[PDB]
Design a binder for this molecule. Structure first.
Ligand SMILES: Nc1ncnc2c1ncn2[C@@H]1O[C@H](COP(=O)(O)OP(=O)(O)O)[C@@H](O)[C@H]1O
Length: 311
């Protein structure tokens, strides 16, 4: 391997393309993967296993998707599992395959059937704490064996997955860590204390890395707005239309589009509502014709749209 190497030394850059900010989190991930490809990790255990602590809407899933895409060359190459739907006893059977003579037997269990059909992939468990403690045991086994045994007794190979578990447990106490005093590492410490209270220490050690996601800064969110309206620019390029934003215009979209409790979840449909909707209005009315560079500024009733007349 030579080109596969080149991609790994430049790995962080490849991820920052799609994931703004969260640099600490990205070293963390990228490192663990270098230790894999170098061959310093136990080869009968998955490429990497992570705990993603932190607020919602600030990059967890994105990184998950991005990683998947930059490692296995597609967003499809990742499996999302929601621990909210696994709070029951009945859960275990849906995860790996309900015992014979059961509704969802031969149709398999979606986890084991996904990994079975796609052995090199990223796997995302959301709200790992919401999981029924039975389901944990199944995960732990997998974390040590790189193997799981489904209902039909067929053994499923996880030695080529990256495992990522998100949880919001820390969050209300990384808010105190946001307030400077607790910088790079001290948060990753004071959180461990709360983690021990919810998670057994056998579990917190199969884990390759515990990663703290921080909230976003205005300038960061501003960047996300750009990446966020990439498809639209491309869409508009087909009719040769440009979209200069203003400093304030970006800030407006950022203002409306970042809920603290939800991060940038709302953003995409804010952009859609505040910028795409009125832009369609203009385009259809003819105030924007094929060719124009449209300028976009803030006002009292939201975004306002300027076109230079013809030279
Ligand atoms: N750091 C980031 N880099 C790029 N996009 C981000 C970032 N943080 C949030 N987003 C945007 O927020 C949206 C959803 O966020 P998500 O990945 O679900 O965060 P979480 O998993 O914490 O809920 C995505 O469209 C994504 O583009």
């Amino acid at each position: 391997m030579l080109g596969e190497r080149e991609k790994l030394l430049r790995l962080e850059e490849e991820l920052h393309k799609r994931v703004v900010g969260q640099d600490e989190a990205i070293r963390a991930v990228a490192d663990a993967i270098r230790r894999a490809r170098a061959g310093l990790k136990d080869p009968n255990r998955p490429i990497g296993s992570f705990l993603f602590l932190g607020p919602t809407g600030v990059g967890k899933t994105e990184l998950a998707k991005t990683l998947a895409a930059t490692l296995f060359d597609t967003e499809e190459a990742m499996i999302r599992i929601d621990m909210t739907e696994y709070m029951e006893k009945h859960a275990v059977s849906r995860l790996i395959g309900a015992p014979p003579g059961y509704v969802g037997y031969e149709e398999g269990g979606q986890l084991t059937e996904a990994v079975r059909r796609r052995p090199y992939s990223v796997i995302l468990f959301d709200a790992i704490e919401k999981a029924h403690p039975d389901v944990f045991n199944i995960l732990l086994q997998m974390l040590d064996d790189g193997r799981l045994t489904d209902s039909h007794g067929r053994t499923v190979d996880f030695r080529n997955t990256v495992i990522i578990m998100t949880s919001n447990l820390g969050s209300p106490l990384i808010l105190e860590g946001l307030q400077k005093g607790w910088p790079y590492e001290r948060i990753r410490d004071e959180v461990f204390k709360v983690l021990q209270q919810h998670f057994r220490p056998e579990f917190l050690n199969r884990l390759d890395e515990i990663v703290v996601f921080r909230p976003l800064t205005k300038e960061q969110i501003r960047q996300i707005v750009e990446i966020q309206m990439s498809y639209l620019r491309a869409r508009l390029a087909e009719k040769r239309i440009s979209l200069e934003l203003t400093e304030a215009a970006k800030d407006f979209l950022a203002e409306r589009g970042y809920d603290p409790v939800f991060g940038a979840r709302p953003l995409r449909r804010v952009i859609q509502r505040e910028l795409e909707t009125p832009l369609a209005q203009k385009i259809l009315a003819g105030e924007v014709k094929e060719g124009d560079r449209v300028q976009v500024d803030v006002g009292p009733a939201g975004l306002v749209f300027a076109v230079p007349a013809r030279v």
